[PDB]
């Protein structure tokens, strides 16, 4: 049994990047002893991401190995650091090294790189990997010194070619007992083997398994174009996220805060923008520490911004509006906003927030800052769907792809802080990072690629992780796809596409409490119920939309009311069909009035069918009253839309068989009474002003 | 001006017949002085109704005229009496006689009778009547004596031929100044002039006008086959019936009573016979003075007679039943019944009453006896129609005909006691008349003519008036036309043909009071009303009819009830359609339930449409309960059909939204509640016995 105190891990790292730090954490988890070569030095090994190079590693390792040239008691494993994680213990590692019978075991990979012609010189291996990879090897310090001491080439010469040629010397391969880990018992290179690697979960740690060879590798190497696949595995392996411990590096359970530049982007017509702008005043972060930048690209939203701007200017430290008249593209506005923070050394954090992001968690900005990441996004999802503001994987084209764990993350089956290839709509970036690692202005622009993808590609090219937290519930994403802007109040038509936000804006705030009991619902007349249904904003916008149409009913107009053996009881009104709001209003009936009626009339069942839905206008100068009649409905819904006293004087609804009068209606409240046989009723005359009501004859 | 004290009317009458008495009344009305010749003598003038004769009148007049052979101061008018009425005063009569310039004025008629060949010998008259009639003449006593003294022929020789031949002597016609009343200024003979005579009304008397000659005759002579037309006129002229005085011989405004033989005839299956038989016990006449004879021709009615007979035998003086097993024809039974009274000198009055005659006036028999007529019938009419138990006129065939005043009599625009040609269904005949004037047994039989017509013809042949009183409301006539006897209780199906009698038998006695207010209707649960609808007999017969059908509902049977989003709520029941009672039950709904629902739910209007009408049977051993549900109706009718306690133990109807229970239903009473939305309800389990209810889902 080889003593783990005799094992030393050597790696190379010119800077403490997130990948290197991820490597060290995995090393410390298993109590590995790591020696890092080359910190602070300038990397002269060339663009190893694009071509060959890396000889500076061999030079640095050769110098280091002269100390141990005679240390036959020492085992050394050289590995990369930026794209390597450790999945197994030193004890298991040494046990497997001894089992190999090798004196210097190199990792094996599928490709013969960089010289593909040398493939013939390699020994024939049946079913395992055949060729050498220089990203990881392990052997006796004496044997390794005899190999690396022969380095005498340029810092930008290829390291793997150097080891390959020495390994292809049959006499040297035999003299020193060199070997390759063909079946990935110790080293797992990802390039050319993605379909062979799966995560193997344990209670408080995660590994990988090679299903081709049925092994559990110690070293996971995201070599070549597999950095993002290694990013995925590194979210779990070895103690990233565990079934019983949860994530292993997030905050989990949570004097001046850092100054922040908040950039808000309005790049398309988006619903509920006044609500979004009002919410900015409610973000739980000291506003004197926040500078606001708002780019509005829509003339449709200029009135919305204008209404909010006095409150925003009075609220935040400083404000800046870039309107549609600047003719800025989205990529130019986002480059501008980010560079305003980049060129300001007092900007410690950049917070980018799009208009379709609804932050229900007012502590979002705090939470993300405490995570102490370079880049981090809150997970936002569209209500009741899988679509959200991040990607778990990339197609080969670098386009959208669904990761293996995407649904688990979106459904918050697994929560934590996740290294992901793409984020959007909301993210917090460290100002230091913009100054030191992404100093260019063309972050979102510069190519024909979509700006939000160029942004993410810009950071992946620099080795900057893009983090995503679902540790908390942060909010949701508005549907903006086909937002019909040709209305006086377009958000009235948003009941289908954005129902949660529609309910918060238009359904009465005390509606849901009334539906749960709690003694809000009243019964002013025997079988006539009274409950809050619409908010004041819904009433005001519906009335406005009606008057904007203008074409109220006149003579010859017929309604479905029964009085004295006749249906000749008309009202001056507009039907929802005329204004194209019937489908929308029928949805309100199914979702909100139906369940209320079944609660108040136990035993009755409804699907809220209604052919007759209309807004009535009473006025002393045209039609102020409505004579006694029955409704052609099983039950009738009657919603007030303005204020008695302020907007009109005059009575409301009289139920004759009960001598019971609703004399003081309440604005967003609805009456619910039977339509036939029992509740013969009358609309009392409006004597001053104008009285609006919304009526539906449901279940005719 | 000729003194009316010089005028003497002479007529002939061997018996004080109704026609003679009618003549004398008209004579006394105008203060005429009448000398009647031949009373008590045997009539030897032959059958003047069938052929020639009447010379006995001329012989009797000749003897009488010898007293006045020299009385030039005296004017004498000879007229018939049995078929003559006087329509004018002696003063007007003498004024017209003088105006004629005649010394002996004979009446004129259209026909030259009895020798038609003598027509050529008559003077030519332009447009008036040409030939002589011996039924009336007026002249000086000296001139008349010179004519009648030449009589020397047989008692059965023709009187009119005698006068005609003397009138056709041109020298004698000239010597004595004989004339004919060509234009009916004084005498109106009806034969051949019916289309010329109309009634002329005054305030307190009635005349006739000749529209051909525009005259007002003094004497109306129903000569030949016009006796019945004279009967019609005699109902008015001169003071029979007047617009301001009413009838002039009826009682108008009304110690042992006469003994009566009451003969009841059941010659066809007739509805409501048990009610008819029960009514016999309620006729307001001392039953110890009444003998009952009942002829039942229908085996269908034998059980009905059997049930009633103990009460009838105990009630009346004596009773006699002739059943179907005697095989008596209607004419034989009516001959038998009438002859039982005829051969019994203690029978002072005969009262014949048919089973389809409903006497609503329990004083009928008294009223008719007080009228002191030989024959008299109460006017009975079929409800809401003109058909009734008399004819006003006869066709030439002696068949049915509508008289000019028939509708006025049936509608009781004119009331009185009327001389009519035909009566039926109910009449009171003086026993003396049967003994002395109609002694034959074959009154209804003897020919192929219908028995009821033979009866009336028998009396008209004897000169017996058939009287009809509409002076009071006496009753009605049942429709018996198509009485469907193939039912367990056929009278249940009589709602159309006999609705007044159907209502009295089957509709609850206190229903109509409840419909007029009076605080019978109850409201045991909020909008659930409770009123009496059916009588106990209706409930018992409907249940019996249901059990007699027997085929109650079982598994797989579906009803129109809504519970928990489903229509799977069945009852063990029978639908009215299955037993062929739906049309009948829908008529009950329209007539009785509809108007009640409109009274209790002001504003609602109904035509009582119902596809779902059925009787439910609850039993502990099959289906004792009915789970909570809604009804597929605007409102629901729910009628109990038996007694809680006596017939079943267990609850009734529970309305869940009100915690209101109808725990003690009342038999013929009905519940009336809404069917939808508000009155979710349950049928509580029947724990002992059997519970029947009648349900209708009206206005679905
Ligand atoms: C919803 O209900 C709350 C509480 O029941 C209402 O709040 C009250 O508002 C009145 C004036 O409108 C105040 O006088 C009370 O003090 C408030 N009570 C509380 C507990 O805050 C609220 O107004 C209701 N919402 C709407 C739209 O009517
Ligand atoms: C119709 O109403 C009358 C009176 O309202 C009912 O007669 C009463 O009957 C009860 C017993 O049933 C007696 O105790 C009372 O004395 C009666 N009152 C009178 C004024 O006679 C009659 O029962 C009702 N008819 C039906 C079929 O229920
Ligand atoms: O600027 C650099 C680039 C490279 N490296 C080290 O050199 C190794 C080789 O780089 P890379 O993993 O990107 O090459 P690949 O494995 O894809 O061939 C990295 O893991 C780092 O340990 C470094 O220290 N500084
Ligand atoms: O039995 C009789 C029949 C006849 N008359 C009288 O004779 C008249 C002639 O009879 P009738 O009127 O029937 O003959 P007609 O007018 O039809 O020729 C009657 O009016 C009676 O006055 C009579 O006294 N006894
Ligand atoms: C690592 O070493 C420390 C002693 O410094 C020990 O407490 C810890 O349990 C070790 N961890 C493992 C995984 O062996
Ligand atoms: C008939 O005579 C009486 C006198 O006895 C007289 O009172 C009556 O008014 C007279 N009637 C007529 C109609 O002349
Ligand atoms: O005026 C009211 O509140 C009642 C109006 C009404 O009942 C109707 O619209 O049919
Ligand atoms: O049992 C009862 O009285 C109620 C029965 C009922 O409601 C029905 O027949 O539908
Ligand atoms: Fe309308
Ligand atoms: Fe209404
Ligand atoms: Fe049924
Ligand atoms: Fe029911
Ligand atoms: Mn590498
Ligand atoms: Mn005559």
DSSP one-letter string for A206-220:
EEEEETTTTB--SEE
Helices A273-280, A302-315: axis angle to 10 degrees equals 10
By C-alpha distance, the chain B residue nearest A566 is B605
In Å, what is the CA distance from A628 to each residue of A214, A634, A672, B607, B686? 85, 17, 17, 20, 43
Nearest to B603 among A527, A635, A680 (CB): A680
Alpha helices in B389-535 (DSSP H): 406-410, 431-436, 451-461, 499-506, 511-515
- Cα A205 to Cα A219: distance, rounded to the nearest angstrom: 15
Enumerate long-range contacts of A574-578, CB under 8 Å, 24 or more apart: A574/A546, A574/A549, A574/A614, A574/A615, A575/A612, A575/A613, A575/A614, A576/A613, A576/A614, A576/A615, A577/A613, A578/A549, A578/A551
Task: Enumerate residues lining ligand 4, CB below 6 A.
Answer: B 11-14, 38, 43, 48-49, 54, 57, 80-83, 135, 223-224
Distance CA A426, CA A379 (A): 8
Question: Which residue in chain B has the smallest CA separation from A563?
Answer: B603
CB-nearest partner of A603 from B526, B628, B634? B628
Task: Report the sign of the C-alpha dihedral through residues B396, B398, B400, B404, in that order.
Answer: positive
Query: For residue B384, what are its two tokens?
Result: 């809401």
- What region does B84 belong to: left with phi over 0, alpha with psi -120 to 50, or beta? beta
DSSP state letters, B572-632: SEEEHHHHT-HHHHHHHIIIIIHHHHHHHSTT------EEEEEEEEE-TTS---EEEEEES
A208 contacts A237 by C-beta, under 8 angstroms: yes
Residue nearest to atom 14 of ligand 4 (CA): B48
Residue of A527, A567, A603 best to disrupt the B interface, most CBs of B under 10 A? A603
Chain A residues with beta carbon closer than 8 angstroms to that of B674: 674, 676-678
Closest atom of ligand 2 relative to the B535 alpha carbon: 27
Residue pair A131/A109 in contact (Cβ under 8 Å)? The answer is yes
- Distance between CA atoms of residues A356 and A387, nearest Å: 13
Which chain A residues touch B672 with a CB distance below 8 Å?
none
Preferred mutation among A527, A602, A678, A681 to probe B, highest tally of B CBs within 10 A: A678
B14 known ligand binder: yes
CB A278 within 8 A of CB A362: no
B225 marked as part of a ligand binding site: yes
**Can you give the residue range of the structural domain that contains B674?**
490-698
The answer to whether the beta carbons of residues B638 and B692 sit under 8 Å apart is: no
> Is residue B505 within 8 Å of B536, Cβ to Cβ?
no
Largest CA distance in chain A: 116
Q: How far apart are CA A365 and CA A291, in angstroms?
A: 13
Q: Which two tokens stand for residue A571?
A: 């009202």
Tell me the nearest-neighbour CA distance from A643 into chain B, angstroms: 30
Residues with Cβ < 8 Å from A415, sequence gap 6 or more? A246, A247, A409, A470, A471
Distance CA A242, CA A414 (A): 9
* Technique of determination: X-ray
Which atom of ligand 3 has the smallest separation from the CA of A13? 24
CATH number of the domain enclosing A603? 2.60.120.620
Q: Is residue A696 in contact with ligand 7, taking CB distance under 6 Å?
A: no
Give the binding-site residues of ligand 8, using a 6 Å CB cut-off: B 561, 571, 616, 626, 631, 638, 652-653, 681, 683, 693, 695
Is B521 marked as a binding-site residue?
no
Burial of B471 per CB tally in 10 Å (0-12, 13-18, 19+) = buried
Please give the interface size between A and B, counted as residue pairs whose CB atoms are below 8 Å apart: 63
DSSP A581: -
Tell me the H-state helices in A507-556: 511-515, 536-549
* Alpha carbons B335 and B350: distance in angstroms, whole number: 12
Q: Which residue of B has its CA nearest to A635?
A: B677
Q: Which residue has the tokens 């990339």?
A: A394
CA–centroid distance, B132 to ligand 8, in Å, is: 86
Q: Which of B565, B604, B680 sits opposite A602 (nearest CB)?
A: B680
By CB neighbour count within 10 A (0-12 exposed, 13-18 middle, 19+ buried), where does B11 fall?
A: buried
- Give me the resolution in angstroms, 1 decimal: 2.1
Given the structure tokens 């913009």, which residue do they identify?
A: A434
Cross-chain residue pair A604–B630, CB shorter than 8 Å:
yes
DSSP 8-state assignment for residue A590: I
Using a 6 Å cutoff on CB, does residue B510 contact ligand 2?
yes
For residue A223 and ligand 3, the question of a CB distance below 6 A is answered with yes
- Distance in Å, CA A547 to ligand 10 centroid: 22
Is residue B445 within 8 Å of residue B339, measured between CB atoms?
no
What is the C-alpha to C-alpha distance for residues A401 and A391, in angstroms, rounded to an integer?
7
Element containing residue A264 per DSSP (H, E): strand A260-266
Contact assignment for A656 to B603 by CB distance below 8 Å: yes
| B528-532 and B522-525 beta bridge pairing | antiparallel
Kindly report the number of other CB atoms within 10 A of residue B439's CB atom.
Answer: 12
Q: CB B254: neighbour CB atoms within 10 A?
A: 9
Ligand 7 atom 6, closest CA: A683
| DSSP per-residue letters across B74-105 | -EEEEE-STTEEE-S-HHHHHHHHHHHT-SEE
Q: Which residue has the tokens 């010394």?
A: B103
How far is it, in rounded angstroms, from Cα A675 to Cα B305? Answer: 55
- In whole angstroms, give the CA distance from residue A281 to residue A284: 9
Q: Is B518 close to ligand 2, i.e. is its CB under 6 Å away?
A: no
**Beta-carbon contacts of residue B543 (< 8 Å; ≥ 6 apart):** B615, B641, B642, B692
Phi, psi dihedral angles at B326 (to 5 degrees): -85, -10
Interface test with A, best of B523, B656, B678 (most A CBs within 10 A): B678
Beta bridge partners of A673: A636
Nearest Cβ partner for B603 among A526, A601, A630 = A630
Mutation choice for ligand 2 from B506, B510, B669, CB with most ligand atoms inside 8 A: B510
Strand order of the β-sheet with B380-382 is B357-359, B475-477, B380-382
CB A574 within 8 A of CB A580: no
CB atoms within 10 A of CB A535: 20
- By the 10 Å C-beta count (0-12 exposed, 13-18 middle, 19+ buried), A537 is classed as middle
| Whether the Cβ atoms of residue B603 and residue A630 lie closer than 8 Å to each other | yes
**Angstrom distance (rounded) from CA B688 to CA B618:** 10
Q: Which residue, judged by its Cα, is nearest atom 22 of ligand 1?
A: A510
Q: How far is CA B27 from CA A332, B32, B87, B217, in A?
A: 134, 5, 9, 14
Do the chains contact at B604 and A565, CB–CB below 8 Å? no
Evaluate the omega torsion of the peptide bond into residue A520 and state whether it is cis, within 30 degrees of 0. Answer: no
Which residues are CB-neighbours of A481 under 8 A, at least 6 positions away? A497
Residue B467, H or E segment: strand B466-469
Q: Which bound ligand lies closest to the C-alpha atom of A666?
A: 1
List residues in chain A touching B: CB distance below 8 A.
Answer: 526-527, 562-565, 601-605, 628-630, 634-635, 656-657, 674, 676-678, 680
Pair B231, B84: CB distance under 8 Å: no
Q: Do strands B34-37 and B7-12 pair parallel, antiparallel, or not at all (unpaired)? A: parallel
Which tokens in the block code for residue A212? Answer: 């081709």
E strand or H helix at A629, and its extent?
strand A626-631
Question: CA quadruple B599, B601, B607, B608: dihedral positive or negative?
Answer: negative
Structure tokens at B128: 């008036």
Q: Which atom of ligand 1 is nearest to the CA of A520?
A: 5
Residue A569 distance to chain B (closest CA, Å) = 14
Overall size of chain B counted in residues: 700
Rounded-to-10 torsion of CA A161, A167, A168, A169: 120
**Is B487 among the annotated ligand-binding positions?**
no
Q: What is the length of chain A?
A: 700
| CB-based contact A677 B634, cutoff 8 Å | yes
């Amino acid at each position: 049994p080889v003593n783990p105190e005799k094992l030393l891990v050597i790696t190379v790292a010119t800077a403490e990047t997130e990948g290197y730090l991820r490597f060290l954490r995995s090393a410390e988890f298993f109590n590995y002893t790591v020696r890092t070569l080359g910190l602070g030095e300038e990397w002269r090994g060339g663009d190893v991401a694009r071509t060959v190079g890396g000889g500076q590693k061999v030079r640095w390792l050769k110098k280091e190995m002269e100390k141990y040239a005679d240390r036959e008691d020492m085992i050394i494993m050289f590995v990369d650091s930026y794209d390597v994680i450790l999945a197994g213990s030193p004890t298991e590692l040494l046990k497997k090294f001894v089992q190999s019978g090798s004196r210097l075991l190199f990792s094996a990979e599928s490709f013969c790189w960089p010289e593909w012609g040398l493939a013939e010189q390699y020994p024939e291996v049946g079913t395992g990997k055949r060729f050498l990879n220089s990203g990881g090897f392990i052997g006796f310090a004496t044997t390794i010194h005899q190999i690396v001491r022969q380095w005498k080439y340029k810092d930008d010469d290829d390291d793997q070619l150097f080891y390959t040629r020495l390994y292809l010397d049959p006499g040297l391969r035999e003299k020193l007992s060199l070997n390759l880990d063909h079946k990935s018992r110790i080293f797992q290179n990802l390039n050319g083997a993605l379909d062979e690697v799966v995560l193997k979960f344990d209670r408080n740690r995660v590994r990988i398994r090679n299903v081709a060879y049925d092994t559990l590798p110690i070293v996971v190497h995201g070599n070549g174009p597999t950095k993002l696949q290694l990013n995925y595995l590194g979210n779990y392996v070895p103690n990233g996220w565990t079934p019983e411990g949860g994530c292993g590096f997030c905050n989990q359970d949570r004097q001046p805060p850092p100054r922040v530049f908040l950039a808000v982007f309005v790049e398309q017509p988006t619903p509920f923008l006044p609500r979004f702008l009002q919410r900015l005043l409610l973000l739980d972060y000291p506003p004197d520490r926040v500078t606001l930048f708002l780019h509005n690209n829509e003339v449709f939203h200029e009135p919305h911004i204008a209404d909010s701007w006095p409150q925003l200017q009075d609220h935040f430290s400083a404000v800046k509006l870039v309107g549609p008249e600047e003719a800025l593209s989205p990529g130019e506005a986002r480059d501008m906003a980010m560079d305003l923070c980049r060129q300001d050394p007092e900007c410690e954090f950049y917070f980018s927030l799009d208009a379709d992001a609804v932050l229900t968690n007012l502590q979002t900005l705090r939470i993300l800052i405490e995570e102490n990441r370079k880049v981090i996004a809150p997970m936002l999802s569209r209500h009741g769907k899988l679509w959200s503001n991040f990607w778990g994987a990339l197609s080969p084209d670098e386009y959208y792809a669904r990761s293996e764990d995407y649904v688990e993350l979106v459904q918050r089956k697994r929560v934590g802080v996740w290294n992901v290839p793409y984020i959007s709509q909301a993210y917090v970036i460290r100002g230091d990072t913009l100054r030191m690692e992404l100093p260019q202005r063309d972050v979102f622009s510069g190519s024909d690629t979509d700006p939000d993808m160029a942004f993410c590609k810009s950071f992946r090219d620099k080795g900057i992780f893009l983090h995503l937290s679902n540790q908390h519930e942060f909010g949701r994403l508005l549907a903006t796809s086909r937002y019909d802007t040709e209305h006086l109040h377009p958000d009235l038509w948003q009941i289908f596409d954005n129902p949660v936000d529609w309910k918060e804006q238009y359904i009465h705030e005390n509606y849901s409490r009334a539906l749960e009991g709690e003694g809000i619902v009243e019964q002013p007349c025997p079988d006539v119920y009274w409950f809050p249904l619409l908010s004041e904003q819904m009433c005001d916008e519906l009335v406005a939309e009606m008057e904007h149409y203008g074409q109220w009913s006149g003579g010859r107009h017929e309604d479905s009311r029964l009085a004295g053996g006749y249906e000749n009881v008309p009202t001056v009104d507009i039907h929802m069909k005329q204004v194209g709001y019937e489908d929308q209003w029928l949805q309100l009936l199914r979702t909100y009035v139906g369940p209320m009626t079944e609660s108040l009339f136990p035993g009755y069942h409804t699907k809220a069918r209604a052919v007759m839905n209309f807004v009535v206008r009473y006025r002393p100068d045209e039609q102020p009253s409505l004579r006694p009649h029955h409704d052609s409905s099983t039950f009738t819904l009657n919603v007030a839309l303005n204020h008695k006293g302020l907007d009109y004087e005059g009575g409301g609804c009289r139920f004759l068989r009960y001598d019971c009068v609703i004399s003081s209606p309440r604005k967003g409240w609805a009456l619910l009474h039977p339509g036939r046989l029992t509740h013969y009723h009358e609309g009392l005359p409006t004597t001053w002003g104008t009285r609006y009501i919304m009526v539906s004859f449901v279940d005719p």
